[PDB]
Design a protein around this ligand. Structure first.
Ligand SMILES: NC(=O)c1nn(CC(=O)N2CCC[C@H]2C(=O)NCc2cccc(Cl)c2F)c2ccccc12
Length: 212
């Protein structure tokens, strides 16, 4: 996260780090035993975390039973850029580890709405990797502006942006997951090149079918 700020410890209890003991991607706890992430983020899952490195009462590492990338995703695209990870056991839920409701209604976020993106991605254009979770509020772009599919959304990127290592993490509007950070390489922080997020509402059938 560029142009952001440190998150409050455990205030975003759905937030996962997909990890060789190293953070690779964000993810969102969406059920007791399932984390939603991005397709190219492919393995363990750290729940309950603020610091990656420091001991915390709520921190717990989970092995993954299986990884279910969207069947239509491809290594060279950011279409269908979703991944569902099943933990090897149901997560211990509490204040600090809690699923986030995700958008099932297929309607766009009002353009202009500030939504919240969190991650342990890089915090500058040198390689700088933060120990503690970062976040930033970002206005959602209208689809025409974003275009210049039905299944992607855009947010402004005027220095404040998602970037490398934020892939698979959340874009939250009004307490509901609306987007998942994309897992393709892109220039960050350039206003002319918006951040790109998978519109979770477009994938409602798919997510349900996996979790069914
Ligand atoms: N949405 C975007 O802005 C964006 N997404 N990616 C892909 C990406 O980060 N990927 C791919 C899957 C794994 C993940 C990855 O490389 N993790 C390893 C990693 C490395 C360094 C630092 C940290 Cl903190 C880190 F976690 C980017 C790549 C470069 C620029 C922008 C982006």
């Amino acid at each position: 996260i560029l142009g952001g700020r440190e998150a409050e410890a455990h205030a975003r209890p759905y937030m996962a780090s997909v990890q060789n003991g190293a953070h690779l991607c964000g993810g969102v706890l969406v059920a007791e035993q399932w984390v939603l992430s991005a397709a190219h983020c492919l393995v363990q899952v750290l729940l309950g975390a603020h610091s990656l490195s420091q001991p915390e009462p709520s921190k717990r590492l989970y092995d993954v039973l299986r990884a279910v990338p969207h069947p239509d995703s491809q290594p060279d695209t950011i279409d269908h850029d979703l991944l569902l990870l099943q933990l090897s056991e149901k997560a211990t839920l509490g204040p600090a580890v809690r699923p986030l409701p995700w958008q099932r209604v297929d309607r766009d976020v009002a353009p202009g709405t500030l939504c919240d993106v969190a991650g342990w991605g890089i915090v500058n254009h040198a390689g700088r990797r933060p120990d503690s979770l970062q976040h930033v509020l970002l206005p959602v772009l209208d689809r025409a502006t974003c275009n210049r599919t039905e299944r992607l959304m855009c947010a402004e990127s005027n220095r404040r942006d998602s970037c490398k290592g934020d892939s698979g993490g959340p874009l939250v509007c009004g307490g509901v997951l609306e987007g998942v950070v994309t897992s393709g390489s892109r220039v960050c922080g350039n206003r002319k090149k918006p951040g790109i997020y998978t519109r979770v509402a477009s994938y409602a059938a798919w997510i349900d079918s996996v979790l069914a």
